[PDB]
Assembly symmetry: C3
Homo-oligomer: 130 residues x 3
């Protein structure tokens, strides 16, 4: 069983594709011609927000699966849901103003350290039984 992990993962991949879509409409609304990524200030906020998310994505996925596999799938899955929401706050907050990114950011960084902690314990815990 990894079905809960599997659901959360497909969920998050849809959010990441959505964010990429938001940048695509921002190019048109603020007339920023590829390959440029600068000019309009709110475009730079949208672009930078989507970039920070897309960077951290594989890191969320790995910690998510290690925790779910070596600690508990249901608990990890729940944390996973919380992360997806924190990233929803981060993205939309930042789009409006750089200081509105702060809540969603702290939320998503909290979950991530926890996931790391849980995955690290279960992996450790698992090897002392051997």
């Amino acid at each position: 069983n990894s079905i809960l992990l599997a659901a959360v993962s497909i969920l998050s991949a849809c959010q990441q594709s959505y964010f990429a879509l938001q940048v695509g409409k921002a190019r048109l609304k603020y007339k920023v011609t590829p390959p440029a990524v600068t000019g309009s200030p709110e475009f730079e906020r949208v672009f930078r927000a989507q970039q920070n998310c897309v960077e951290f994505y594989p890191i969320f996925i790995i910690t998510l699966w290690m925790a779910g596999w070596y600690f508990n799938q249901v608990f990890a899955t729940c944390l996973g849901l919380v992360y997806i929401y924190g990233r929803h706050l981060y993205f939309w907050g930042y789009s409006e103003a750089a200081k509105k990114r702060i809540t969603g950011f702290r939320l998503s960084l909290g979950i991530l350290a926890l996931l790391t902690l849980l995955g690290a314990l279960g992996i450790a815990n698992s090897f002392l039984d051997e």
Copy 2:
């Protein structure tokens, strides 16, 4: 094991990505762009942006590829996987010659990514209704 095809596509796609990184490295030398800068030459700037768009989407493609292959069909996911790799080849070399000649390869690889997403969502769903609610769409 019953993932041997997925593993093969993954390794192929990973080689294409390292290949894209090599071109950026060679473009840096051809147009004399001093690191860590990434602007100055229009032809460099198109190559950099192209590799950037590919390298962003890579983990999304991988998750979508494996979820399709595990919960829907390894052979169908595997075949789409190859075409996606092909589309990104068009996108990259397309964008490199002109900003607007990236579009065919762009629509191809994204169309495919969505189909794979669809399949992954169905199979995961089907497996979920059969494992916590005892309902299979089997008929």
Copy 3:
């Protein structure tokens, strides 16, 4: 029986987060206010190095697991550790001067390449097991 892969994977994730933190400390120290990523030579080097690392991360993870799953987990694990070390040289090297990034860059692309090779052999050998040929005949 993927316990070693899991461990290396958690180490590398911590490494990546530590790098992200450096960019954050650099933002405060050289006054680069978000969403800007230019404006200070020392920041731009730290930023660019961290960007190269996080982009290459999923490529390393896939390659690590295909090798570890289809060839040998202990050997893939060891290569994984040396790669994490190469990225350590690369990042701090680049932070001091763009031209001190080259050793760690070479070590880690060397490793990635070895991992890509081993995974390809292992998948091949493993594919022949549904053709019933196993090169346990070379063992």
